[PDB]
């Protein structure tokens, strides 16, 4: 079901990512900073377990998690959350949740990249990222 996720992306393109980071509440340091990287994500699986690792010069994380599982996640910008990650029409959904907010990370494979997709408040960043041999 994830299979075709599974891998090293290296990010090719961004569109919108400092609204996004902004909607998040990032300082503009760091917003420069990330504006400036180009992340690898890196998706592997063991059974039911999916662990996905982001490394950049800036910032580095990583989850693990099972589908349909709740999970606690500090993410990139040090937000503490609640997070879930599903399958849906073949999307990775990640949602996670926080001070009664949420945000989307939407994860579409379209002709063999991967397509992420960020939503939070009125923001939506869309970041693709091609795969690696
Ligand atoms: C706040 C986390 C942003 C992650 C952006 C990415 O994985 O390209």
């Given at each position: ?11 090719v ?100 990249k ?15 990222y091609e795969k690696?041999?």
């Amino acid at each position: 079901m994830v299979d075709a996720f599974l891998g090293t992306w290296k990010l090719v393109d961004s569109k919108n990512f400092d609204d996004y980071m902004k909607s998040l509440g990032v300082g503009f340091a760091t917003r420069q900073v990330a504006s400036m990287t180009k992340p690898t994500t890196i998706i592997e699986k063991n059974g039911d377990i999916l662990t996905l690792k982001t490394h950049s010069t800036f910032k580095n994380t990583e989850i693990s998690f099972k589908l349909g599982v709740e999970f606690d996640e500090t993410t990139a910008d040090d937000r503490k959350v609640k997070s879930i990650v599903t399958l849906d029409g073949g999307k990775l959904v990640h949602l996670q949740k926080w001070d009664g907010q949420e945000t989307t990370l939407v994860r579409e494979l379209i002709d063999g990249k991967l397509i992420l997709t960020l939503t939070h408040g009125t923001a939506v960043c869309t970041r693709t990222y091609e795969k690696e041999a």
